[PDB]
Amino acid sequence: TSKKEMILRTAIDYIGEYSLETLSYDSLAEATGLSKSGLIYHFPSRHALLLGMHELLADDWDKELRDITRDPEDPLERLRAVVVTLAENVSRPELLLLIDAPSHPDFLNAWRTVNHQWIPDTDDLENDAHKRAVYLVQLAADGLFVHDYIHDDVLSKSKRQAMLETILELIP
Amino acid sequence: MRTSKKEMILRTAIDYIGEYSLETLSYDSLAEATGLSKSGLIYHFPSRHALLLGMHELLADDWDKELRDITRDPEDPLERLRAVVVTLAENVSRPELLLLIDAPSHPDFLNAWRTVNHQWIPDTDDLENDAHKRAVYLVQLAADGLFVHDYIHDDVLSKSKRQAMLETILELIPS
Numbered sequence: 001t002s003k004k005e006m007i008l009r010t011a012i013d014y015i016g017e018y019s020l021e022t023l024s025y026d027s028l029a030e031a032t033g034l035s036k037s038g039l040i041y042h043f044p045s046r047h048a049l050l051l052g053m054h055e056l057l058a059d060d061w062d063k064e065l066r067d068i069t070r071d072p073e074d075p076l077e078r079l080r081a082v083v084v085t086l087a088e089n090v091s092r093p094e095l096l097l098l099i100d101a102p103s104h105p106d107f108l109n110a111w112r113t114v115n116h117q118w119i120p121d122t123d124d125l126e127n128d129a130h131k132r133a134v135y136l137v138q139l140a141a142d143g144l145f146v147h148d149y150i151h152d153d154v155l156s157k158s159k160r161q162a163m164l165e166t167i168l169e170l171i172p
Numbered sequence: 173m174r175t176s177k178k179e180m181i182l183r184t185a186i187d188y189i190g191e192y193s194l195e196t197l198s199y200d201s202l203a204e205a206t207g208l209s210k211s212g213l214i215y216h217f218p219s220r221h222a223l224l225l226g227m228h229e230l231l232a233d234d235w236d237k238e239l240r241d242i243t244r245d246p247e248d249p250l251e252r253l254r255a256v257v258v259t260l261a262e263n264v265s266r267p268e269l270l271l272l273i274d275a276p277s278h279p280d281f282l283n284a285w286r287t288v289n290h291q292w293i294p295d296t297d298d299l300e301n302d303a304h305k306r307a308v309y310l311v312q313l314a315a316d317g318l319f320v321h322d323y324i325h326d327d328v329l330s331k332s333k334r335q336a337m338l339e340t341i342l343e344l345i346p347s
Contacts, residue, residue, distance in 0.1 A: 019193075019195045020193075020195075021193050021195035021196060022195065090324075095273065095324070098323060098324045099266060099269060099270070099323045099324075101326065102266075102322065102323065102328075108326040108327075109326070111325075111326040112326040112327075115325060115326050115327075119325070122327070122329065122333055125333045125336050125337065126332050126333065126335075126336045132336060132337060132340045133340070135337060135340075136314060136337065136340050136341065136344070138317065139313075139314040139315075139317030139318055139321075139337065139341070140310055140313045140314040140317060141317070142316070142317035142320065142321065142324060142325075143312070143313030143314060143315070143316030143317040143319075143320075144313055145317075145324070146316065146317075146320050146324060147313070147316065149272065149273050150269075150272050150273075150316060150319075150320065151289075151293070151316075152275070152276075152282055152285060152286050152289055153295070153296060155296060156296075158300050159296050159299040159300055162299055162300045162306060163299070163306065163309060163310070163313060166306045166307075166309075166310050167310065167313070170310070
């Protein structure tokens with residue numbers, strides 16, 4: 001694990017316990033034990049630090065997808081991988097980052113790199129029933145992904161597994 | 173004025189979160205945003221807790237009224253579900269999502285939402301042994317995905333695309 005990744009992992013844990021707003025070279029220095037100087041060497045600006053966190057999370061997901069996809073050339077298999085990985089409740093740090101990404105095209109682009117490769121295409125959704133049927137699966141998976149943060153009642157493991165299976169059945 | 177001053181303060185606070193964050197929302201930043209004095213704010217909201225609670229209540233109430241306005245035969249679980257899907261097809265705002273996420277921090281905030289959720293959102297009771305319940309919750313999950321889309325994905329989903337998916341989700345309802 002490189003020094004850059006360790007710093008990034010620490011910053012990600014930090015925003016979860018505190019906030020993205022209080023994340024700074026000072027608080028991250030304290031959290032990592034590194035000098036503010038050492039931090040800047042790896043991430044020259046706060047913008048760069050944030051970008052790095054988005055890129056790392058996006059990469060983690062890409063790896064997880066590649067790791068469980070039974071057939072990378074089968075669109076439905078890629079979709080199954082997406083659904084399965086998204087069935088797990090999103091972490092607080094990742095959700096906060098996801099919500100902050102729209103604040104800059106650079107952050108959005110960090111995620112675009114991976115999303116464009118796995119998320120069902122939205123082009124011509126208006127007139128292609130098949131693309132809608134596939135994207136419908138994406139939506140349900142996303143709902144399961146954020147469920148516990150927008151619904152006052154957390155889903156039990158069994159109930160979560162039940163819905164995952166229900167969504168999987170939706171795949172053509 | 174089109175609303176009470178109290179509601180105006182809440183609306184401003186919500187907008188503030190949008191421009192900035194929930195983290196920096198305080199009597200000072202709100203005084204600046206509303207142009208009122210911390211003293212005038214305190215009159216309406218005795219504590220930051222009260223301010224936050226007021227925001228949760230206002231948003232929960234906004235949604236309840238939206239649902240009430242567009243639901244015909246609200247006694248029918250399916251008509252409630254149809255209306256819920258329609259209201260959730262428009263993406264959540266960053267401030268509302270931020271508040272939803274923070275609601276569990278205190279039961280007062282949760283209770284503010286449960287009041288409306290209980291009347292319109294499906295429970296997860298016996299989800300593992302009820303096929304009909306799973307069919308309904310599947311629709312709920314998809315509507316939820318449409319609802320949060322722009323804040324969990326890089327791309328903003330256009331109105332026309334949201335409309336197409338809304339119709340698709342509606343077809344999924346057990347009629």
